[PDB]
Amino acid sequence: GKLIRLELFNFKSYKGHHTLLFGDSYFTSIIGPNGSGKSNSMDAISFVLGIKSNLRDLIYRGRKTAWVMAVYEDDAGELHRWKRTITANGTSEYRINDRVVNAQQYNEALEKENILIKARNFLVFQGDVEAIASQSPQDLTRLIEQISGSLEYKEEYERLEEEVRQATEEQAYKLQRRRAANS
Amino acid sequence: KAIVQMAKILRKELSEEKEVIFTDVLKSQANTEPENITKREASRGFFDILSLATEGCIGLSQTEAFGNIKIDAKPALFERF
Amino acid sequence: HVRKQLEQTEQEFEASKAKLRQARESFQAVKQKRLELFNKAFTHIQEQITHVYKELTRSEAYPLGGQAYLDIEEDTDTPFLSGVKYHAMPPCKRFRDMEHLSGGEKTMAALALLFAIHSYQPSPFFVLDEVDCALDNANVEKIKKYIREHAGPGMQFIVISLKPALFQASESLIGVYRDQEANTSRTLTLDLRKYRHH
Amino acid sequence: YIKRVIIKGFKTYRNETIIDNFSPHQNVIIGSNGSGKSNFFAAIRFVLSDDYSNLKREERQGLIHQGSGGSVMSASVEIVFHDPDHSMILPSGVLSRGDDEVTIRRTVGLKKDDYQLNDRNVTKGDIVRMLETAGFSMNNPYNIVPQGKIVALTNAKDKERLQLLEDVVGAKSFEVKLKASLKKMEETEQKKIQINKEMGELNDLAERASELDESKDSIQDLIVKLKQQKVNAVDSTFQKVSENFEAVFERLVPRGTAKLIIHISVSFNSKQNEQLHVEQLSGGQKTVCAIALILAIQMVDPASFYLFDEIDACLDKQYRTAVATLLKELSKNAQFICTTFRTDMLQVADKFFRVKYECKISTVIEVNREEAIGFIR
Ligand SMILES: Nc1ncnc2c1ncn2[C@@H]1O[C@H](COP(=O)(O)OP(=O)(O)OP(O)(O)=S)[C@@H](O)[C@H]1O
Ligand SMILES: Nc1ncnc2c1ncn2[C@@H]1O[C@H](COP(=O)(O)OP(=O)(O)OP(O)(O)=S)[C@@H](O)[C@H]1O
Ligand SMILES: [Mg+2]
Ligand SMILES: [Mg+2]
């Protein structure tokens, strides 16, 4: 499908209700001078889909609450309103189609339409090209381990590495003190 | 260079009228009918008015999705470009 | 007295060996799962990185473009534990060390790597920051010719850009200006299908 | 100040490449991505500064031209100055303002080839000795702005900026000398504690124990007094930096205030607003504050030639206009070699060089008014 629009309310620079309309356009560029909030709109895109990577810092400062809603239409034609809200105490409420949803079902509804935040395939941050141009081969292995979906089963891999290593080492010294008991 | 030209067209359109439509300034600058205006000119003028607006010299109003842009004058427009 | 001690130590040793086999075959199972899930993504990006770099480095003066490939240092049993080296060779250029490349050539290789990583699990949209602002006009025009040829149904492009050679060819503009007397950001939008080319 | 550069056999250059006739005011080198306009700066750094100090075979092969199997022998860069009075080591046939025999060709080979001093092979020490008395320094953080430094000073946190300020002061002559006395402290402690306890076993050795106790008192005296010297230098340099930064930022941005608060964080804004450090900033004003800090670092010790590889990355019309006007005002005292892609430092500069790209070799030409033609095509 495609993103129809974002609706922002008291997100970083945007005092009150603002609307970022994409419409029928499959190539829409965000322009403006420095300090204007283009990267704030990209951070609204990044935040409305569930990136945590200071959650009170996103509310607007003049000198209460904040929310951002992504409207997305799939291949059938139905809208999927995804609203994230920063409430008064620093907790984030998730809503799909005006219905309150927890974290895992929200990310499951995103992964249903091939939006994988856990892979982060589709966001290029300011300076990420210079970072990946200055990356190490281990950093690039980490990135392909990220996007492959195989960054999961990592802690299970290392845990069971320790399990089989303790098991074979205890087996070997079991053999040695067993022949010592036979001695 | 560019913003001075845009500033002159805005001082001219906003000297007589209280509000002016962006597409009228674009037709005035291109010196042709709107069907012949090109993407490079429209984008250049659009970015120029965003820059002029960010400095606090002009006002911008748009009330419909992909609708007309209404431009109004501020006092600071006639002393800083 | 020692014989039943011997058999009990032997059999709990055998039970430890049996749970060793349990954890070991479970380790080989999760290792094979991790290996296949890494290997299919590796094969996909290795086959697409060449085509995206040929699309990013060809022009009128050189129609075939450069060539790029990423590969395992030490392919023995676990490619996911070894490093991947990314070789990116522009037109008429060849090195032994990759960091001798330019700013624009590094930005081109980085953008080719990001576009080849992205089309493994293709998201319905793709958002780009100001990656164009370390580039000359020819590389910005090649970025525009790549994006205009790929933006469509199933792959939407939203770029944050300051270079007019890039955002002059978008399908619509979202112009964000900071209203300073109210201390807010504001948006305007413009349809670039109303205007002609050239 | 600097007069003409002669580059032969370097990384993307021909059999000999002469760039000449640039006035001591601001001069701009342009090209395209892959031309070598950042490799000319790596030809300048190869002689004057100390980036390429002592190199093994891979770094030498990175320097030497791999040009289609030809001229892989050597690389050489000569830089000619002009001065009414300039420092020197030995007279060596003093040319009339042609002091190039002192900044010698810097010949490197596949093996360790040692360069000369007008037909006499002479160590690097005499070169850095004459550049000592020429008002320069071979490890300054301002005379080299390479590709990726201003983006590094926009992602450096507060302690790394304080360490770069500490190397701007050069106050590790009060710190690593204090680290040598720290070596003295650890060895003296775990030696002479055992020495005085075995002397107290025997106890005229209590005299030796007493003056080693007063030697540890002397260690205390020197460490607290050199910490006093370190803070005495650092806060004076910071009192210079903070106000230079205030003046530079109020000249760049004519609508805001900018200080430094030492704990480094930079409390600034763009109008009558609050404080925001480098976590909560747009990339535009982040690179504005980074180049304002570096234009403050120049003002603690000004030199005669500077190198600006894309000092205005991707800012704005107003920010490039302000940086170009401030650099034109600053070019009344020193050379300002720069690199641009945008014409805001082309309408105000004086000399314009173009690096003509081919795909293995490159050469530099000089016309002045075809450059804005080359960028506003
Ligand atoms: N929570 C907040 N409340 C109010 N203002 C904020 C907040 N967070 C950030 N800002 C301001 O918004 C600015 C960021 O504006 P952006 O529009 O993101 O910059 P940008 O212009 O899009 O990126 P550049 O400059 O073009 S690379 C910061 O520099 C702050 O001045
Ligand atoms: N030993 C070498 N033999 C041949 N070519 C080399 C050698 N070392 C470097 N080069 C080339 O020299 C060039 C160095 O890049 P530069 O053009 O200096 O960067 P730049 O393009 O000037 O700066 P940008 O555009 O802002 S990234 C590249 O084209 C390298 O391939
Ligand atoms: Mg930004
Ligand atoms: Mg460069």
From TrEMBL, chain A:
Annotated compartments: Chromosome; Nucleus
Transmembrane segments: none
Leader sequence residues: none
Record-listed Mg(2+) binding positions: 126
Domain of life: Eukaryota
Family: Belongs to the SMC family. SMC1 subfamily.
The protein, known as: Structural maintenance of chromosomes protein
Annotated organism of origin: Chaetomium thermophilum (strain DSM 1495 / CBS 144.50 / IMI 039719)
Shown segment, full-protein numbering: 2 to 234 of 1264
